[PDB]
Design a protein around this ligand. Structure first.
Ligand SMILES: O=C(Nc1cncc2ccc(F)cc12)[C@@H]1CCNc2cc(Cl)c(Cl)cc21
Ligand SMILES: [Cl-]
Lengths: 297, 302
């Protein structure tokens, strides 16, 4: 029993964190094989800025050992620093780009040293509601599938509302952001509907049934209601993805939707679900199945 | 900016997780140097869970009855001893991944990270607090026994909790790494119930200071309170009494934000009376009590 916001064990990623210094700027890098990946803002015409740099301008520190940079190249908004030493702690990994609503663990780092791990979701507006201070740039987001680390996020900046913006490991930003000092704002955010439904199934699995009702709804009627409350549309793919949870609890997805509709129009009425007075949207259907079944890494 | 429930990076603990099997029971062990620590109930046959005589059960065991697996390698048990509710299995190999560590016993209200494990394999990491009723509101399934709670301030891992059991209300009970249970709990299947839980007042105040540091001030008011008047009101909402120690501990946050502790205590009293009125504080519609004053300073300042 219990339902917590749970991150993946961070060990395989901790062994990859390094400190990258260029001039007065110090941030984090991800050392995989003989390449250190970091935000290109560590060095704006980034082709012009980068051409003026030599390998010895980049100081890379892995623990108390200084790595020697033997090459450098830029791929979108990420700088790739070729080093002479392959990271002996390089796990089996992939670079994956995630979609809004997908969750991942963030290993927040400062000066190449991991300080914390937390679980978050890529918001529909492409920001993340993270917890980052100055020096956190280069901290990474990841998932673990069996023994493989899928790197999906690298932190680049904080927007004026306190939310965070970054890229996949190929340097493509999530969202309409740029790594430049200019006026940028997070768009109007929406609730990840499929995740709220998954979290309601987690509540049912944990014995919290008060919100259940005898009613069902059509997908179209649910989406008409969901659009009114700034919830993301629920697709047939989402309904299919929720199938296993629907079979385990005996509550059809559209039956759980009628519960969600009633919660949106009437509120919680002083009650809580899994210790929360708000509908939680940062657990995917896969996260719910993984936590309510105990998959290990 | 931002405020998240943040766990310590679990790497230093993951390299210590092993699987311990005795008869039909399999659970997790913590392998530090040449000793594997695990719940002593691993020697129990479930039929002896109501009134187990652990000394009697352990005397009948030999080293080769304990199967310890570290990854795909079987460790050889060369000795065993019991210390309170923890079994210590001496092994013939020191864990090369043993971090710098300490065993610390925590007090109610203290927070720690949990590395939930099954079959000696880490599955997830989450943050939690030792409730005032000495239980933890964890996320654990069968086979999670032996999973540990820890803090990693600096490069040293302070082990503070080892999971032993789930109570009928879904909450969890366990011991420190010396085998002493937190609370009045026993590793017996006798009827046991968690006492009425209360809100960790000092942690709620720390979290309100975190909200102020992050730019949120809507809940502040022009009032102050005496500590006694605050406690009289606090007790009525099932909040833990706030002591002078708690007020002292909140001093640094009070100095940073410019809001005296008793002034913040008056915002809390008003929040308890009015609720949030559709508003949130740090993205929460409930008052959060699983962040200590130390966690707030660490996350908001460094
Ligand atoms: O508490 C236990 N198991 C589990 C632990 N944490 C979450 C668990 C969730 C579900 C579950 F069925 C078992 C879970 C074990 C085995 C069942 N009984 C029992 C009784 C006593 Cl006295 C002791 Cl010390 C340990 C146990
Ligand atoms: Cl403590």
């Amino acid at each position: 029993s219990g339902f917590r916001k749970m991150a993946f064990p961070s060990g395989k990623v901790e062994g990859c964190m390094v400190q990258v210094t260029c001039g007065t700027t110090t941030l984090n890098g991800l050392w995989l094989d003989d390449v250190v990946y970091c935000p290109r803002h560590v060095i704006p015409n980034y082709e012009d800025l980068l051409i003026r740099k030599s390998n010895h301008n980049f100081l890379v520190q892995a623990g108390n050992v200084q790595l020697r940079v033997i090459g450098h190249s830029m791929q979108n908004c990420v700088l790739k620093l070729k080093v002479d030493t392959a990271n002996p702690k390089t796990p089996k990994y992939k670079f994956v780009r995630i979609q809004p609503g997908q969750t991942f663990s963030v290993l927040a780092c400062y000066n190449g040293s991991p300080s914390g791990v937390y679980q978050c979701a890529m918001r529909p507006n492409f920001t993340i509601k993270g917890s980052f201070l100055n020096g956190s740039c280069g901290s990474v987001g990841f998932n673990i599938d069996y023994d493989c680390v899928s790197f999906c996020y690298m932190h680049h900046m904080e927007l004026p509302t306190g939310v965070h913006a970054g890229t996949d490991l190929e340097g493509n930003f999530y969202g309409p952001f740029v790594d430049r000092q200019t006026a940028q704002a997070a768009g109007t955010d929406t609730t990840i509907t499929v995740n709220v439904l998954a979290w309601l199934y987690a509540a049912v699995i944990n014995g919290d049934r008060w919100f259940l009702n005898r009613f069902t709804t059509t997908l179209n009627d649910f989406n008409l209601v969901a659009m009114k409350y700034n919830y993301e549309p629920l697709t047939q793919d989402h309904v299919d993805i929720l199938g296993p949870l629907s079979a385990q609890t005996g509550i059809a997805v559209l039956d759980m939707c009628a519960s969600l509709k009633e919660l949106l129009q009437n509120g919680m009425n002083g009650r809580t679900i899994l210790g929360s007075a708000l509908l939680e949207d940062e657990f995917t259907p896969f996260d719910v199945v993984r936590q309510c079944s105990g998959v290990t890494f």
